[PDB]
Amino acid sequence: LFPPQWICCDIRYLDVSILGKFAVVMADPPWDIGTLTDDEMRRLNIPVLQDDGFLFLWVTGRAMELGRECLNLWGYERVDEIIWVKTNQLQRIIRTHWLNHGKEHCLVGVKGNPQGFNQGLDCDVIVAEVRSTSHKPDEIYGMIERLSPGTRKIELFGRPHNVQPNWITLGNQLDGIHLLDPDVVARFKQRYPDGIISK
């Protein structure tokens, strides 16, 4: 299933063990600073999603610390930190408590011992235009594709405009369930025969 796939769900309740293993996980959680409590975040079954690979975790504010905690609790070591410098259409920094903030951070965690990834191709600064509220730059998908070409990836807390080839996207603002990978389809039907994803 190379084309985009997605599952509208409450990520707290989905049995993510049906989705298999992924080279890259990316998440942009609704940190409690429609949100998840710190305990709900800690309890996410991230550990089943990967054996060896990388996690990309967007953070702001006190989630710079809570996100590190989660990353470690889930079994990752933080090994890089991408910053997105937020610009307008003319490549000028958009200036938004002690300092105006010109950037957002994406923690990069590693689990296991990833082999065959193209580390060091991209640098750790993204310069990209702001779009609607919370919309992260599409540049990150290209960085991740160059890092790990053709592998399966999963995005948590994505919206419709986040769906991409080679990715499965999970989130509660997606429209229904679009699955094409026959292994995932089979396991989904077995786990959710009536298509309903409840507590």
Binding site: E81, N100, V127
Partner: protein, 236 residues
């Protein structure tokens, strides 16, 4: 226009394409204490000898990664910074780009601070378009964490990458710190002759000269001047 792809294609870092109060600088300059400085091997020196307690501490330990006497995070975390920080005070800790982003946060909490800003020194390579085994990406920035204890600038500094073997941090960090108007007892640990500055006490192993005297230094802050912010007029 994907500047990430462009960097892969050409070696020009994305930050190369970012397109880039007098009275307040004036008041800071007027209220600044004289520069004071002390050569001290900080690993072998009882920092409690540095008095009075500081409103602002800038901490710039010489990390191994800056070169590629260096200080490890083991060394740094065992500094007793809480013993010289005022009950309400601020810290600015240069953490580099690797494990310091984690261990520097541990240090801040160990010394009784909470992080309130993460200031990123973003390095362009306009002049020279074109490591760590764990690294996933080319590292092109450094972080200076701001911590607070007790009850117009942006969190980005953009300059060209320095020539190799030059470990200086951008002087812009002093501008940011001084514009906060946090108090006048300002300590720069692991500063150098090249970083000495009015309004600051600089302490470090490579200083060639000293002029620090604890009693003279304390007299700069004795009444009626004990609580000035560093941004208001001198008291007649």
């Amino acid at each position: 226009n994907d500047y990430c792809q462009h960097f892969v294609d050409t070696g020009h870092r994305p930050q190369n394409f970012i397109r880039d109060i007098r009275l307040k600088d004036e008041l800071i300059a007027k209220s600044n204490t004289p520069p004071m400085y002390l050569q001290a091997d900080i690993e072998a020196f009882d920092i409690r000898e540095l008095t009075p307690k500081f409103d602002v501490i800038l901490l710039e330990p010489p990390l191994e990664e800056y070169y590629r006497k260096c200080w490890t995070w083991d060394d740094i975390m065992k500094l007793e910074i809480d013993e010289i920080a005022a009950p309400r005070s601020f810290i600015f800790l240069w953490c580099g780009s690797g494990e310091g982003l984690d261990l520097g946060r541990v240090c801040l909490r160990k010394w009784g601070y909470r992080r309130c800003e993460d200031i990123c020194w973003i390095k362009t390579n306009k002049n020279n378009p074109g490591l760590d085994p764990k690294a996933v990406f080319q590292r092109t920035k450094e972080h200076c964490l701001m911590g607070i204890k007790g009850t117009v600038d942006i969190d980005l500094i953009i300059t060209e990458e320095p020539e190799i073997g030059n470990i200086e941090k951008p002087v812009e960090i002093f501008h940011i710190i001084e514009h906060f108007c946090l108090g006048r007892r300002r300590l720069h640990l692991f500063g150098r002759d090249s970083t000495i500055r009015p309004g600051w006490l600089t302490v470090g192993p490579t200083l060639t000269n000293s002029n620090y005297n604890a009693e003279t230094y304390a007299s700069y802050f004795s009444a009626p001047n004990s609580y000035l912010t560093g941004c208001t007029e001198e008291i007649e």
